[PDB]
PDB file of C-alpha atoms in Angstrom:
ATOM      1  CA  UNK A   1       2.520  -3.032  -0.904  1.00  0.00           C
ATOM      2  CA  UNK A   2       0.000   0.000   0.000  1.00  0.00           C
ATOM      3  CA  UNK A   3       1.309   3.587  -1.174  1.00  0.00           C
ATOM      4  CA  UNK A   4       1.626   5.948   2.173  1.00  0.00           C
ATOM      5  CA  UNK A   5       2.772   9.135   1.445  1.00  0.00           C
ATOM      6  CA  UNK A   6       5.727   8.844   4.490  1.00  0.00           C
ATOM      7  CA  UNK A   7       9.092   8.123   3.271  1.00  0.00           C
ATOM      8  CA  UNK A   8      11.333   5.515   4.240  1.00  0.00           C
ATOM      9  CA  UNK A   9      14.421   5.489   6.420  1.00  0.00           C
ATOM     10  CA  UNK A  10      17.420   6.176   4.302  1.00  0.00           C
ATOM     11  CA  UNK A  11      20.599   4.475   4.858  1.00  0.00           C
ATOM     12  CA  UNK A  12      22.313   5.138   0.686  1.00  0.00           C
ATOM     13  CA  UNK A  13      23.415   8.533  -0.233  1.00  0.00           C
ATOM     14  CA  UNK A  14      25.307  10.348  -3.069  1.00  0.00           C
TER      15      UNK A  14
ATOM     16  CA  UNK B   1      10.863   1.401 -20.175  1.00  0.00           C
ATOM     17  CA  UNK B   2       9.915   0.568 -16.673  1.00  0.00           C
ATOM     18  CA  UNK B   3       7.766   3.394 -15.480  1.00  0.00           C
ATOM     19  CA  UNK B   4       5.747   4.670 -12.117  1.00  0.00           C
ATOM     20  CA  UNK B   5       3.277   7.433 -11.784  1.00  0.00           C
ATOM     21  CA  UNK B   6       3.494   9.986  -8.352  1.00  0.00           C
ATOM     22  CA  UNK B   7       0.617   9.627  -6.383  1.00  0.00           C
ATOM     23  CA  UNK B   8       1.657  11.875  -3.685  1.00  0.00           C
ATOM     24  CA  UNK B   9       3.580  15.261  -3.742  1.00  0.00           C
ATOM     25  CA  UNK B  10       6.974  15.000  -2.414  1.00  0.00           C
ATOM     26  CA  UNK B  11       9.178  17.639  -1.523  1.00  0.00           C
ATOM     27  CA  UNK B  12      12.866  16.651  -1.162  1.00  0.00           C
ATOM     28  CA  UNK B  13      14.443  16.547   1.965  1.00  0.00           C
ATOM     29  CA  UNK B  14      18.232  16.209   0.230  1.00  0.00           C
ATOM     30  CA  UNK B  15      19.879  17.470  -2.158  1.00  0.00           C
ATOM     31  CA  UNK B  16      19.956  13.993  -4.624  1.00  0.00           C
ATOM     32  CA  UNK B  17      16.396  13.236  -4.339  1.00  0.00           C
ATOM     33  CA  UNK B  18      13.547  14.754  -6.946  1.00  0.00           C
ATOM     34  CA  UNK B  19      10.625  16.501  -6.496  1.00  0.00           C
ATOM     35  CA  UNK B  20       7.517  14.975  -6.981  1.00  0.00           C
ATOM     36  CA  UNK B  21       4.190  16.313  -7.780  1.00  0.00           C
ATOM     37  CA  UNK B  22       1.030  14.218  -8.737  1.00  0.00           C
ATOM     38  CA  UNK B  23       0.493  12.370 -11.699  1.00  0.00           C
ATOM     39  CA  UNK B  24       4.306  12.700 -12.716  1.00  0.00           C
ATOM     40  CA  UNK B  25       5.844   9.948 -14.848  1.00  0.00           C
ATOM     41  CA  UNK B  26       9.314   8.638 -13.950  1.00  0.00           C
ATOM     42  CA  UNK B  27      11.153   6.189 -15.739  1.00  0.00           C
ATOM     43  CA  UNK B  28      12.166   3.898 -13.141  1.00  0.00           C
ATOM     44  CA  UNK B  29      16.544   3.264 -13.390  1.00  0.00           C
ATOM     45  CA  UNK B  30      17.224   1.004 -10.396  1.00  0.00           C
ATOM     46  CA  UNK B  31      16.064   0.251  -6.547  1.00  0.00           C
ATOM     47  CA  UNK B  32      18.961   1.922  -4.529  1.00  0.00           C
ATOM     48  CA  UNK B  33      16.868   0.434  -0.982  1.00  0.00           C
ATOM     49  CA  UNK B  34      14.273  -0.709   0.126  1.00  0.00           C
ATOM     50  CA  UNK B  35      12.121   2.358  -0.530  1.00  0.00           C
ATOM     51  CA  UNK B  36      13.714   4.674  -2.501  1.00  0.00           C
ATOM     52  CA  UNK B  37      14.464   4.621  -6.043  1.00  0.00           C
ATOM     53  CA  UNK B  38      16.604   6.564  -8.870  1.00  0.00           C
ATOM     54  CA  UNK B  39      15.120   7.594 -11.732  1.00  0.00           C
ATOM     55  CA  UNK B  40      14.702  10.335 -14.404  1.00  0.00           C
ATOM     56  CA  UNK B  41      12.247  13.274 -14.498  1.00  0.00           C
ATOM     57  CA  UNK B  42      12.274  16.119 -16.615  1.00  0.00           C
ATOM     58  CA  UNK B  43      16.023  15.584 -17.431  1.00  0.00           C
ATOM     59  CA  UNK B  44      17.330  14.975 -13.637  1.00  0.00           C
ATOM     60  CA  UNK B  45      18.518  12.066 -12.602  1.00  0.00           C
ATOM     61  CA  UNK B  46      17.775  11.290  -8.842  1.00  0.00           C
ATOM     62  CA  UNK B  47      16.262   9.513  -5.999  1.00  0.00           C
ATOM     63  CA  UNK B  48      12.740   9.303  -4.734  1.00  0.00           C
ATOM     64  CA  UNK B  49      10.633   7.437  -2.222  1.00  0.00           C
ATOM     65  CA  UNK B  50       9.267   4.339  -4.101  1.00  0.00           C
ATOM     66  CA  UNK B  51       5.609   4.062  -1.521  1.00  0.00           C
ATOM     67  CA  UNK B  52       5.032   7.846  -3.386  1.00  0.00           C
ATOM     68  CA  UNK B  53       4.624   5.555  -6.506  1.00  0.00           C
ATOM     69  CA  UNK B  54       2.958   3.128  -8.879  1.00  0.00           C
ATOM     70  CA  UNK B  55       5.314   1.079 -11.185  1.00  0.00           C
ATOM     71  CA  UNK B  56       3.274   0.612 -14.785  1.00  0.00           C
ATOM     72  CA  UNK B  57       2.507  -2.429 -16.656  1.00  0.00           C
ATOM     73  CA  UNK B  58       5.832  -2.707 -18.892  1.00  0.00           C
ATOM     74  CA  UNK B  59       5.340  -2.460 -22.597  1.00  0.00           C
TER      75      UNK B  59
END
């Protein structure tokens, strides 16, 4: 999976 | 191509990700993590939070 509009974590940048 | 539409607005919150507004199309380069995704919009290449999207039938 259902579209949420709250971002994941991110861990990779770049 | 492997495609998603924007379903949500997203404004970035770093400098390497894209802006989304609703209804864009993005054609889909690779899944960098869980979640977020690079792609291409409007000539930028950048990253983007794939549960703002729908991937497309490919085709």
């Amino acid at each position: 999976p259902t579209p949420r509009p709250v971002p994941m974590k991110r861990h990779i940048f770049r | 191509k492997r495609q998603c539409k924007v379903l949500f607005e997203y404004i970035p919150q770093n400098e390497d990700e894209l802006e989304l507004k609703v209804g864009d199309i993005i054609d889909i380069n690779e899944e960098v993590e869980e979640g977020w995704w690079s792609g291409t919009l409007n000539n930028k290449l950048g990253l983007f939070p794939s549960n703002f999207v729908k991937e497309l039938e490919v085709t």
